[PDB]
Amino acid sequence: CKEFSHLGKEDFTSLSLVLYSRKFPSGTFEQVSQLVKEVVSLTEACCYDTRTSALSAKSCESNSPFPVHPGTAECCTKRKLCMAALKHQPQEFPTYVEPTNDEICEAFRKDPKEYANQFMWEYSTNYGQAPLSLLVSYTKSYLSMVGSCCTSASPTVCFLKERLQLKHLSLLTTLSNRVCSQYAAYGEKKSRLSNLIKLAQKVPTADLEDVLPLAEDITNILSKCCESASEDCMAKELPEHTVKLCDNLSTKNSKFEDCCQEKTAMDVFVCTYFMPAAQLPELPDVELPTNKDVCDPGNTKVMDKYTFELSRRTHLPEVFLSKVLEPTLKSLGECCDVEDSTTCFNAKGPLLKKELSSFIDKGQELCADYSENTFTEYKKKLAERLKAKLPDATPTELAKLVNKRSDFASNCCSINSPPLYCDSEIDAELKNI
Ligand SMILES: CCCCCCCC/C=C\CCCCCCCC(=O)O
């Protein structure tokens, strides 16, 4: 109620559209607009579960106006406020594409309101994991640009200049959506390890000491800035993070040196982000940390050292590594709070080693040749491998397997593969062939 008054009607409604578009990434323009239509109608005539209930209720109605969370129609079976318990899944495959200047201005003069609403909805559903404060700030600035540029002396020049002034906020928002989505999908502890893994893969040359502080720092920034309703801090924190990146890795790797030479902190960050897993020196094998030092609740130095060492020695994608480390380390951890840890470790050790080895072997089998070749060249070697394992396979059957397996590998064998999507795709591929 307090916000509705201080913000007004139209503005409070704008905030809501962005707010609810983030919540229902899969929702349609119509549905989200409809839900917001009545959420305001509520606040207004209540500034009260008389309307709050009418909302949750009219939400289950088969073929309902409102957008639906996965599990809504399910747990609706009725309390009945299970809906608030349901967590929303991010959109990992953004499809937002900015129209041409003409497309923008024609749409804008014809219907200024719906053009801005369609934009706030589509931009927010696509990059809904970026901080609310940032989305609101970018979409308001963007609409202001559209507003002034389409009626300027020369829209073309206006747009060229104004988009340049907005590039920073623009890249910051999509970048923030990407890293915060990964953060929300994994949770703080796994995100931290995930980032430690990726840095290890990008610079196996470095020592644990060069990358750990960085995994720590990015993690601190995300837990602090990924969620803010009015004052964004991603812009305040990320630049100094690139300074740490360069201080520690600028001289440890040629490619990092080049990244660190770019014009802005944003460019340095993006550049390091897109950097793929480099060729690994292939050092000696590393045994699981089956020792009392992993029991330190105060530190994770041991778990971090193992994670780091495993990453710079095992040619496997981070989505795979992060996936198996969690259960593995948790299993080890079960030998901590017992009367005799040594006996527990000596028993669990041989078992975890085989399970890990099996997972790793299968994962490297699923991603074989992807990283070292161009997609096309990958597709070619992949077929040869399949041909050798399936001599009686018709060319059609081989084509289908090549298609399926190359689809999986393009989605889940890259350093920046989608966590949520791959988690389930990996489960399936593991019990394959
Ligand atoms: C989702 C990643 C799974 C990776 C498997 C590596 C081992 C993890 C350790 C313990 C969890 C158990 C899962 C394996 C099934 C066998 C059951 C058993 O532990 O006896």
DSSP string, 12-57: HHHHHHHHHHHH-TT--HHHHHHHHHHHHHHHHTT--HHHHHHHHH
Is the shortest distance between the CB of 333 and ligand 1 below 6 Å?
no
Q: Is 296 left (phi over 0), alpha (psi -120 to 50) or beta?
A: beta
**Is residue 320 in contact with ligand 1, taking CB distance under 6 Å?**
no
Number of C-beta neighbours around residue 200 at 10 A: 28
Nearest atom in ligand 1 to 356's CA: 6
Q: Using what technique was this structure determined?
A: X-ray
Q: Is 71 in the pocket of ligand 1 (CB under 6 A)?
A: no
Whether 323 lines ligand 1, by a CB cut-off of 6 Å, is yes
DSSP notation for 319-370: HHHHHHHHHHHHHHHTTTSSS-HHHHHHHHHHHHHHHHHHHHHHHHHHTTTT
Q: Whose CA is nearest to atom 20 of ligand 1?
A: 351
Asked whether the beta carbons of 239 and 268 are under 8 A apart, the reply is no
Q: Rg (Cα) of the chain, in Å, rounded? A: 25
3-state helix, strand, coil split of the chain in percent (to 5) is 65, 0, 35
Q: Is residue 355 within 6 Å of ligand 1 at its C-beta?
A: yes
Q: Which atom of ligand 1 is nearest to the CA of 323?
A: 2
The dihedral built from the CA positions of residue 323, 328, 331 and 337, taken in this order, carries a sign that is: negative
Contact 132, 22 (CB under 8 A): yes
CA of 424 to the centre of ligand 1 (A): 15
Element counts in the chain: helices (H) and strands (E):
20, 0
Q: Atom 17 (ligand 1): residue with closest C-alpha?
A: 355
Report d(CA 191, CA 213) in Å as an integer. 14
- Cα(165) to centroid of ligand 1, in Å? 51
Cβ–ligand 1 distance for 215 under 6 Å, the answer no
d(CA 377, CA 79): 57
Distance 83 CA to ligand 1 centre (A): 32
Shortest-distance Cα residue to atom 14 of ligand 1: 355
Does residue 407 contact residue 376 with C-beta atoms inside 8 Å? no
Structure tokens at 312: 């710079």
Distance 328 CA to ligand 1 centre (A): 7
Smallest CA-to-CA distance from 39 within 29, 31, 51, 26 is with 51
Read off the amino acid at residue 217.
D
331 in contact with ligand 1, CB cutoff 6 A: yes
Answer whether 322 contacts ligand 1 (Cβ < 6 A). Answer: no
Domains contained in the chain, CATH given: 1-87 (1.10.246.10), 100-187 (1.10.246.10), 188-275 (1.10.246.10), 291-367 (1.10.246.10), 374-433 (1.10.246.10)
Residue type, 285: D
Torsion sign across C-alpha atoms 23, 24, 28, 33 = negative
CA–centroid distance, residue 426 to ligand 1 (Å): 14
How far apart, in whole angstroms, are the C-alpha atoms of residue 152 and residue 146? 10
Mutate which of 355, 356, 426 for ligand 1? The one with the most ligand atoms within 8 Å of its CB, which is: 355
Burial of 363 (0-12, 13-18, 19+ CB in 10 A): buried
* Distance, CA of 19 to CA of 253 (rounded, Å): 42
Q: Quote the CA–CA distance of 274 and 238 in Å, as a whole number.
A: 16
Instruction: Give helix 395-412 / helix 375-389 axis angle, nearest 10°.
Output: 130
Does residue 227 line the site of ligand 1, with CB under 6 A? no
Two tokens, residue 91: 């959109």
For residues 136-155, one letter each, b for 16 or more C-beta atoms within 10 angstroms of the residue's C-beta and e for the rest, the string is bbbbbebbebbeebbeeeeb
**Residue 362, ligand 1, Cβ within 6 A:** no
Cα 349–350–356 angle (5° rounding)? 85
127 lines ligand 1 (CB under 6 A): no
**Among protein residues, the one whose CA lies closest to atom 10 of ligand 1:** 327
* One-letter identity of residue 325: L
Distance CA 403, CA 180 (A): 31
Q: What is the C-alpha to C-alpha distance for residues 86 and 76, in angstroms, rounded to an integer? A: 11
Resolution in A: 2.3
CB of 90 closer than 8 Å to CB of 25: yes
